[PDB]
């Protein structure tokens with residue numbers, strides 16, 4: 290099996306939905322004024338991470354989507370993407386930090402489930418999802434700290 | 447083909463993400479004061495529609511996820527789901543009616559592509575998506591009318 294451009298571009302187009310949430314809800318002064326941990330990355334790190342992940346996750350899905358028995362893996366993939374799209378509107382749109390922690394935690398679970406199901410069909414597709422699970426872990430940690438350091442403000446859920 | 451509860455519940459859980467956007471962004475007085483066409487349904491119709499569609503689309507995806515060549519169909523399904531999740535944050539969260547029309551139009555394309563790809567593998571999966579395409583058409587019309595009848599308000603954007 291090889292590069293299937295129809296599949297890859299379909300999965301890449303699907304990443305247009307979360308990318309659109311980030312483009313329309315760029316962090317503002319509210320984000321700057323939030324209490325954040327010292328290990329909170331600078332602003333320019335986040336566009337680099339998600340652009341890379343969108344390409345990595347669509348490559349991996351393209352490989353898996355060509356294999357028999359793909360059904361459960363691709364259902365997991367649909368779930369993680371939808372909750373990925375949900376996160377930025379919850380955190381930066383509605384300003385509900387605690388609810389957003391629930392969202393990223395569910396997303397984390399489905400990312401892990403997708404990665405595992407990918408490993409059962411295609412090892413490289415699973416490997417391609419390893420930096421996504423690492424980054425999703427990191428995002429979960431940053432959501433928790435932001436929520437914790439601003440617990441006494443109404444933005445907590 | 448089979449009744450596969452693991453697959454069905456995975457697709458149903460995936461619809462929790464768009465359902466969460468609806469739960470968190472209930473239409474308010476801003477929606478009430480918008481100019482609407484006469485065929486704009488009452489508020490109680492929309493929860494009925496979307497609950498039904500979540501189950502129909504998950505049953506249909508469950509059938510497709512059990513066949514060979516499902517990959518392109520499920521990639522279309524993933525794409526459609528993510529833009530479904532994106533719509534309500536754009537229209538009711540950010541209040542960008544014109545931008546939301548672009549989102550529902552892309553979602554419409556992927557609904558149609560999913561339904562057609564579903565018909566190539568399983569007729570029942572395709573038929574189950576016919577009420578989804580109809581409702582998405584209807585939703586597109588309501589977005590268009592809302593934007594057009596309120597063109598001179600800043601939310602038309």
Ligand code: HEM
Pocket residue numbers: 307308309310311312315316331332333335336337339340373374376377393396428429431432435
């Ligand atoms: C699952 C969790 C998350 C998702 C899906 C997500 C998604 C995104 C997306 C799509 C972008 C746009 C990147 C681009 O323009 O190419 C972005 C940027 C950004 N996000 Fe995240 N994000 C998540 C977690 C977080 C967290 C926890 C924080 C802060 C505590 C955060 C802060 C930012 C910032 C500061 C930027 C870029 C701001 C700038 O470019 O000036 N994100 N994110």
Ligand code: HEM
Pocket residue numbers: 464465466467468469472473477488489490492493494496497530531533534550553585586588589592
């Ligand atoms: C792709 C397009 C759309 C999606 C994905 C979507 C999604 C949803 C969801 C998930 C709910 C929650 C239903 C529930 O609570 O069970 C909802 C309710 C609702 N939506 Fe939509 N919607 C769309 C288009 C529209 C449009 C175009 C309008 C109006 C012009 C609209 C108006 C409403 C109203 C009035 C409610 C319920 C309000 C209430 O229960 O009091 N929706 N929608």
Ligand SMILES: CCCCCCCC/C=C\CCCCCCCC(=O)OC[C@H](O)CO
Pocket residue numbers: 295296298299301302304305308343518
């Ligand atoms: C039966 C097989 C044939 C049918 C299969 C359909 C094949 C093409 C589907 C979608 C491509 C259109 C989407 C535009 C191209 C994707 C790359 C892109 O530009 O969007 C990525 C996104 O912007 C990143 O953030």
